[PDB]
Amino acid sequence: IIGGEFTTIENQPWFAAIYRRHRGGSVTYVCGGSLMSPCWVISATHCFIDYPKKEDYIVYLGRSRLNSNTQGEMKFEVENLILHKDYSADTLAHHNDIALLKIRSKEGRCAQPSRTIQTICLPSMYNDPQFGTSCEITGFGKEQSTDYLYPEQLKMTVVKLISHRECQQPHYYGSEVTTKMLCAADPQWKTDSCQGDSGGPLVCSLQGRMTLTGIVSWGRGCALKDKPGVYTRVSHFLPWIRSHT
Numbered sequence: 001i002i003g004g005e006f007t008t009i010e011n012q013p014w015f016a017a018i019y020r021r022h023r024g025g026s027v028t029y030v031c032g033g034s035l036m037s038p039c040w041v042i043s044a045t046h047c048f049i050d051y052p053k054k055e056d057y058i059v060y061l062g063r064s065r066l067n068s069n070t071q072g073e074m075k076f077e078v079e080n081l082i083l084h085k086d087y088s089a090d091t092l093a094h095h096n097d098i099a100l101l102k103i104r105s106k107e108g109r110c111a112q113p114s115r116t117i118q119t120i121c122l123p124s125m126y127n128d129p130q131f132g133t134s135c136e137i138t139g140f141g142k143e144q145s146t147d148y149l150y151p152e153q154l155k156m157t158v159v160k161l162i163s164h165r166e167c168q169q170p171h172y173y174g175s176e177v178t179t180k181m182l183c184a185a186d187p188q189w190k191t192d193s194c195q196g197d198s199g200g201p202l203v204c205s206l207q208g209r210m211t212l213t214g215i216v217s218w219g220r221g222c223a224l225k226d227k228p229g230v231y232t233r234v235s236h237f238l239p240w241i242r243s244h245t
């Protein structure tokens with residue numbers, strides 16, 4: 001997250017930290033995700049497609065720092081990695097960028113809700129918030145595009161949603177951005193998600209209810225003028241999410 005503020009997991013308790021174990025034992029951070037029911041975390045297929053072996057991943061719920069074992073966290077392995085069957089990647093745009101991770105502890109259990117581990121609600125069919133709405137994103141991604149290290153403490157920021165007709169303007173993304181995708185950004189281009197934030201949540205408060213409106217997917221640079229962050233529009237995928245869970 002470029003700009004924004006430092007935060008801890010009690011303020012974003014549906015956030016999942018997803019890591020991959022390499023041959024030889026080291027473990028590195030991969031992408032974010034969101035808890036939608038005790039056994040199911042949803043994220044982006046691009047974080048996994050080049051390493052599609054479910055045994056390789058470690059998922060933490062309740063975790064606030066990249067290298068510290070936060071009180072109350074829970075650690076899980078992946079029982080089923082489900083990637084969308086018509087996923088694909090153009091130069092900038094990524095399509096059907098959505099994945100499900102069914103999680104289980106070493107004892108065979110799903111997550112146990114607590115003050116620092118909670119689910120986030122799914123949207124309804126045909127009802128996403130109007131353009132101009134403020135929504136929050138969260139992750140452990142880069143604080144500047146020239147960094148190579150990620151921040152030790154979790155960050156968040158707030159951005160505004162952008163219409164399909166503005167996002168398809170020539171100096172923004174043209175016809176590369178589609179109606180299955182949602183754009184959001186700072187009007188002053190100073191804060192955004194960035195590499196390392198992919199898969200993480202775009203949460204919007206809609207008619208009273210905090211709602212998983214989007215999944216971090218792609219963008220040209222980070223916090224670059226006229227180049228929004230682009231997010232998978234979760235309401236379109238409700239028939240795929242219900243049939244695969």
Ligand SMILES: N=C(N)c1ccc2cc(C(=O)Nc3ccc(CN)cc3)ccc2c1
Nearest residue numbers: 046192193194195217218219221222223229
């Ligand atoms: N401008 C943003 N909000 C934004 C949002 C998401 C972003 C994602 C990546 C990224 O590195 N993506 C990626 C895509 C596919 C693969 C698989 N080769 C690996 C990483 C990099 C920069 C990104 C920037």
